[PDB]
Structures are given as C-alpha cells and as structure tokens.
Design a protein around this ligand. Structure first.
Ligand SMILES: NC(=O)c1ccc[n+]([C@@H]2O[C@H](COP(=O)([O-])OP(=O)(O)OC[C@H]3O[C@@H](n4cnc5c(N)ncnc54)[C@H](O)[C@@H]3O)[C@@H](O)[C@H]2O)c1
Ligand SMILES: NC(=O)c1ccc[n+]([C@@H]2O[C@H](COP(=O)([O-])OP(=O)(O)OC[C@H]3O[C@@H](n4cnc5c(N)ncnc54)[C@H](O)[C@@H]3O)[C@@H](O)[C@H]2O)c1
Lengths: 291, 291
C-alpha cells in the first residue's frame, strides 16, 4: 500500500476547508486549491478562526500551547490557484468542489494527466456516482469516494465509497489515512446515498409527508422523535440544519434515477420553502424561523 | 373535564408495571390487574426494586426518605384478578395486555358495562386500530390511545392517539394526566404507527434491505448511523433489542392494511430469522449473537 503524507485538497469551502484543517492538525502536508487567490485568502482565514475555537477547548488549561497549535498547524497548509502544478508530488487528491458532474469530470480528467502514478483520487460527492468520475480517468483502480460529514472537524464518520474498479491497495491506504485523521471509516458500495444519507433522507421526507397529511404537527413530530427515539434533533430541525435546498437537490436527483418510487416523490410543502428562499438556518428560515 | 385521580392498569407486564409504577409514584392511586396471583405478585415485587433504583442511587441529598417513599408509593397500588370488580370506581382504565385484537377487544366490551360513566378508556396498543377497539364499546367519545415507551419510568414521551370519535373533554383529560406523570404528550390521529414507530420502523427495515441488497455490512450500517446520524443504537442493534417478532408483527399488520406501499413490504431476511426463533436479545440471537 501507500502512506498518505502529502494531501491536495481542491475546493476550499465548507467541506474542503474542513478536510484541510483536519488533515493538517494530524500532521499532513496540505495544499489547498481553489479558484481565486482571494477565495483562498478567506478560506484560510476561516480555517484559522475554526482552529482557534478548537484550541480554546483542547488547550483550555494553557493558551500558549493553544496558540502554538494554531500556528504550527496552519503553517502546514499552503495554497494554489492551479492544482495542475502541485499534484505531480501529492499522495492524495481530495476533491470537494461544486456538486456538478460536468465540472468534476473535467477536473479529474485533467488532473489524471499530471498527478503521479501512485496518487489516489477521491471525491467527496454526496450525490454523484463515484463510478462516473472514476471513468473520467484511466486511474480507476486508484479512485474512490471519501465522503465526509459536516462539520468535518466534529464528525468522526467517513464513508469510503468503492467502485467495482477500486483496488484493495487503494482502500487500505484510504482507511489508514482516515484513521490518522482521527475518523472512523465504514466500507460502502457506489450506490445512491451510500449508507447514511440513503437511510437518513428518505426518513426526513416521510416526516414531512406525515406532516402534510395533517396526522400530526411539526413541533410534536420533533419532540416525538427526540424523546421517544432518542434522536439528537427532530426531523424538522434537522432539515433546517442541513438545509432544505441541499436536501431537496439530493432527493430530486434520486427521484429521477427512479421516478416510480414512492420514497422519492417531491414533498410539495418542501418545494414551498425552497422556491421562497427559506432554505433553513443558512437563511434564517425553513420549517422554522431562526433569529 | 375529569382530573384523573384513580387509575386502573390492566396488565402487569413490561409496560403495565411501568405505568402502574410511574402513576402511583405521581400521587395517583393505582390498581394492578392480571390473570394469575403468581403474576400480580412478581409485577409488584419488580416494581419495588425499580422504585429503589430510583431511590437507593436516586434522591442524592437525603437517602433516608427512600424505604419510606418506596413504601408510600408501593403502598398505594392495590391488586385484583378481576377488573370487573374494580372499574366500578376508577376514572381511567389503561390497558396493556397481550397484543391481540380479539382478546383486547372482548375485555373492553365487558368492562364497558361494569365501568363508571366519567371513566376513560385508553389502550397502549402499538399495532391495532384504536377505532376498532373503541367500537367494542359504546363509550367511543371516552376511548383513546395512550402510548408509552419502554421503560415507562424513564422514557418521557407518550403519544395521545385520538379517534375521530374521541372527545375534546377526553383528550385534555389525558393530556393533563400525562403531564402530571412528568411525561410529555404529543397528539396524533389513529393512523398506523402513530408518530414514532411510523417514522422509526420503516427505516429499520430499509436498513435491513440495504444489507440484503449486499451494499454494506450490518456492522458498518450500525457504526454509520451511530456516528453519522447520532443515533444511540445502530438499526440492527436496536432491532435485536426490540425483538424481530415484535417488529415483524407490526410490519405485516400495517402491510395488510396497505399492501401496495413498499415501505411495509416485509424483509425476507427478517422472516428467515424469526422463522427459526432468532428474535434478538430475548433469545440471545437476532442479527447478532449474545453469549
Ligand atoms: N456541505 C455538505 O452538506 C456536504 C457534505 C458532504 C459532501 N458534500 C460534497 O462536497 C462538495 C462541495 O460541497 P461544499 O459544501 O464544500 O461546497 P461549497 O459550495 O461550500 O464550496 C465549493 C468550493 O469549490 C470551489 N470550486 C468550484 N468549482 C471549482 C473548480 N472547477 N476548481 C476548483 N475549485 C472549484 C469554489 O470556489 C468553492 O470555494 C460537493 O461535491 C458535495 O456533494 C457536501
Ligand atoms: N413492550 C413494548 O415495547 C411496548 C411499547 C408500547 C406499547 N406496547 C403494547 O403493550 C401491550 C403489552 O405489551 P407488554 O410488552 O407490556 O407485554 P407483557 O406480556 O409484558 O404484559 C402484558 C401483561 O398482560 C397480561 N395478560 C394477558 N392476557 C390478559 C387478559 N386476558 N387479562 C388480563 N391480563 C392479561 C399478562 O399476563 C402480562 O403480564 C401490547 O398491546 C403492546 O402492543 C408494548
């Protein structure tokens, strides 16, 4: 196998900035690639802001050590606006840019030409096929899905999505890497939703459907799931936290890849808030209205 | 309305015992009923302990008022082998006997006679229609669902199921009662699974379906939902914990009542297990082996 040391992260937004911070904090050389040197500027700023928040907790009884952690860490993170030139020496490329088949495809198709032979490609896509992406390269044996959860620094889970073409050497390399990140890996097939989302989202909708038929109220349904099922958040809050447009996007996508399926029908009450920019907490209002 | 002071709890089983307990423990004057004397004894003995567990290790400050308290409470819990001889004065009958429509149905048709006027009837059924139980009487406006979660003394939720026949007086009556037990009531129509199980069980099966499909492993699914969703238990752990039969039951039932929904579509894998008495923990083997 291979030991991942140098990690190139493409896309420096929510997920990527996260994957960056974590890879660093656990002693990995990280190159953070995005489109504008200014995007990268803001990107890194946030990572610093997030690292300090973590430092006041992890080194609360010694701020000096705290301040060191942030410096040392944050230094292991370098940036670039052109992945093309920093990938001939990287061990792993973790992609987490716009959820768009066309765009990712071009990126990988291009990167497949520059990255070194041993380099592993991994997409953090929640809804596309890890197989489509992999076939946009001649490196399929070294391509997989590394699906993280937001916020990355906090979520201990990671799904290692394999296609029929992914070699066992690649996996082990990715499972180790994952652990080094202080995360816990679960093996999954290239199927819609992987594990979590496939069992979580259909559930969130059913709760909306149950609300639409008038059988119970939003408030009660949440209270019920939280106190009766032991869930951290009721389905209605959860949807507001992860964002309706995010969820809507995913659900419609599956719905197409299988329209005659009941579990994927569009929740009209859910297409309201979306078509009205009530996406969730991102925008201060969804099923609930936030301060 | 009615301020439920006296209570009758038909059935001293798992649920009955909790209700009986939590009830008396909250000022109410309970009465425990079952079929045999051997039974009634054990139920009350097992109550004591639980009370003490919420005593010995509970009541941090002053330990003293425990064996006193445990008596005050335990002392206000009569016991009969015939409900007919008691419903005469109670003002709330909570049934929690074997999950059988006929059996559960006749009992009610009977008690409807000997019962008092004001008296309210509630069933703790999880898989039957409250409406069809209420019609085994002529007190439909005072018959409702009272659904508790195991273990009663701990789980602080209670689903208050109303039939299109249940009266407003009868609901607020039950709500107040629910609240004076420290429990938090949520209202819901008489639909299958009410709220919780309606949203919980299809997910458990979906989990099992994902496994059967071969997409992932029992262990990974479990690790996934626990670490990614935040759930206390993985779908297969939880299933083995509530019993494959208990779960099989509920599903087949809702399936007959609607065989076209794929949600209720039974899982071969689960029948195969139940078909060879592997119900889970109460057998030491469900999807997992125990000892
Ligand atoms: N946020 C979630 O809830 C979540 C969870 C898991 C996985 N994901 C997946 O992660 C990916 C990104 O999600 P996000 O929330 O981090 O996104 P985002 O919208 O916060 O940021 C995407 C970043 O990608 C950059 N980008 C876009 N096109 C690019 C290109 N061609 N080259 C280089 N950089 C480019 C942007 O400039 C932007 O900073 C998606 O594929 C999505 O499916 C999202
Ligand atoms: N245990 C759960 O997870 C759960 C949760 C909610 C609701 N319920 C519902 O509660 C009811 C009982 O479940 P349980 O788990 O408490 O079972 P259980 O078997 O522990 O308790 C039922 C009690 O009823 C008694 N009984 C049987 N037939 C009787 C009759 N004709 N007259 C008087 N007493 C009789 C039994 O001897 C037994 O002690 C069912 O209707 C079920 O759907 C169960």
């Amino acid at each position: 196998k291979i030991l991942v040391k140098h990690v190139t992260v493409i896309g420096g937004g929510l997920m990527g900035a996260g994957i960056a911070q974590v890879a660093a904090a656990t002693g990995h050389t990280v190159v953070l690639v995005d489109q504008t040197e200014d995007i990268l500027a803001k990107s890194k700023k946030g990572i610093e802001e997030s690292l300090r928040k973590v430092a006041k907790k992890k080194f609360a009884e010694n701020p000096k050590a705290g301040d060191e952690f942030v410096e040392k860490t944050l230094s292991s993170i370098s940036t670039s606006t052109d992945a093309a030139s920093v990938v001939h020496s990287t061990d792993l490329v973790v992609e987490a840019i716009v959820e768009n088949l066309k765009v990712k495809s071009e990126l990988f198709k291009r990167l497949d030409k520059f990255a070194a032979e041993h380099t592993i490609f991994a997409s953090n896509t929640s809804s596309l096929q890890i197989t489509s992406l992999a076939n946009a390269t001649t490196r399929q044996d070294r391509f997989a899905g590394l699906h993280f959860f937001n916020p990355v620094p906090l979520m201990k889970l990671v799904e290692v999505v394999k296609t029929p073409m992914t070699s066992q050497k690649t996996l082990e390399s990715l499972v180790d890497f994952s652990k080094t990140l202080g995360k816990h890996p679960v093996s999954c097939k290239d199927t819609p939703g992987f594990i979590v989302n496939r069992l979580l989202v259909p559930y969130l909708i059913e709760a909306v459907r149950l609300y639409e038929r008038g059988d119970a109220s939003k408030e009660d349904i949440d209270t019920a799931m939280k106190l009766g099922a032991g869930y951290p958040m009721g389905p209605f809050e959860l949807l507001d936290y992860v964002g309706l447009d995010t969820t809507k996007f995913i659900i419609d996508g599956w719905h197409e890849m299988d329209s005659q399926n009941p579990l994927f029908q569009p929740s009209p009450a859910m297409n309201k808030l979306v078509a009205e920019n009530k996406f969730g907490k991102k925008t201060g209002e969804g099923f609930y209205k936030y301060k």
